[PDB]
Amino acid sequence: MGPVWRKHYITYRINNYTPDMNREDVDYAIRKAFQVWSNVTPLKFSKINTGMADILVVFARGAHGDDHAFDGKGGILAHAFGPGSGIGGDAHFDEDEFWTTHSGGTNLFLTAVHEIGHSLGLGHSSDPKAVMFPTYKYVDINTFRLSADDIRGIQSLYG
Numbered sequence: 395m396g397p398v399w400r401k402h403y404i405t406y407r408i409n410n411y412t413p414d415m416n417r418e419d420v421d422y423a424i425r426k427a428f429q430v431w432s433n434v435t436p437l438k439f440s441k442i443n444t445g446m447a448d449i450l451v452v453f454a455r456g457a458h459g460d461d462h463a464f465d466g467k468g469g470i471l472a473h474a475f476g477p478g479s480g481i482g483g484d485a486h487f488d489e490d491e492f493w494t495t496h497s498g499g500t501n502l503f504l505t506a507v508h509e510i511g512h513s514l515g516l517g518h519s520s521d522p523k524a525v526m527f528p529t530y531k532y533v534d535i536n537t538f539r540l541s542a543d544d545i546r547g548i549q550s551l552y553g
């Protein structure tokens with residue numbers, strides 16, 4: 395007797411894949427985006443296309459009943475939630491948009507780091523250097539790191 399856990403394994407699955415690029419790249423961006431946080435936090439992400447996952451990545455295109463569901467080339471990028479019931483855990487992205495591996499446009503990996511942040515449950519940061527922030531900035535993948543302000547935020551997640 396002695397049940398214990400604290401996430402450990404973030405099992406995730408994508409609902410569909412942006413045909414805009416090669417699927418490999420599509421999951422690569424979101425994979426890597428997770429991985430970034432999965433490196434810093436003790437969380438261990440795991441994509442599984444075959445089975446049942448804990449969270450779900452909802453790429454939807456100008457559809458689904460919401461207030462700000464999704465919209466075309468601009469407007470909403472993506473919205474997702476960690477600490478909540480039902481949808482909580484799961485992460486929704488504007489498939490309507492033409493996301494790009496290259497920085498030019500909207501980089502999937504870039505936005506993904508923030509939405510993955512939502513799913514893990516990180517609090518909205520308030521510094522332009524953080525990626526969890528509600529704002530956007532053209533972060534250079536050359537650097538590939540999280541801000542100090544961000545890092546305290548993520549470590550706030552005891553699990």
Ligand SMILES: COc1ccc(S(=O)(=O)N(CC(=O)NO)CC(C)C)cc1
Binds near residue numbers: 471504509525528
């Ligand atoms: C890190 O990637 C982001 C991309 C877009 C935005 S946004 O400012 O266009 N926006 C969407 C968003 O925050 N998604 O998580 C909120 C908007 C209502 C101002 C924010 C972060």
Ligand SMILES: [Ca+2]
Binds near residue numbers: 465466488
């Ligand atoms: Ca949009």
Ligand SMILES: [Ca+2]
Binds near residue numbers: 450
């Ligand atoms: Ca959920």
Ligand SMILES: [Ca+2]
Binds near residue numbers: 412489490492493
């Ligand atoms: Ca798309």
Ligand SMILES: [Zn+2]
Binds near residue numbers: 459462
């Ligand atoms: Zn929605």
Ligand SMILES: [Zn+2]
Binds near residue numbers: 508512518527528
């Ligand atoms: Zn946000």
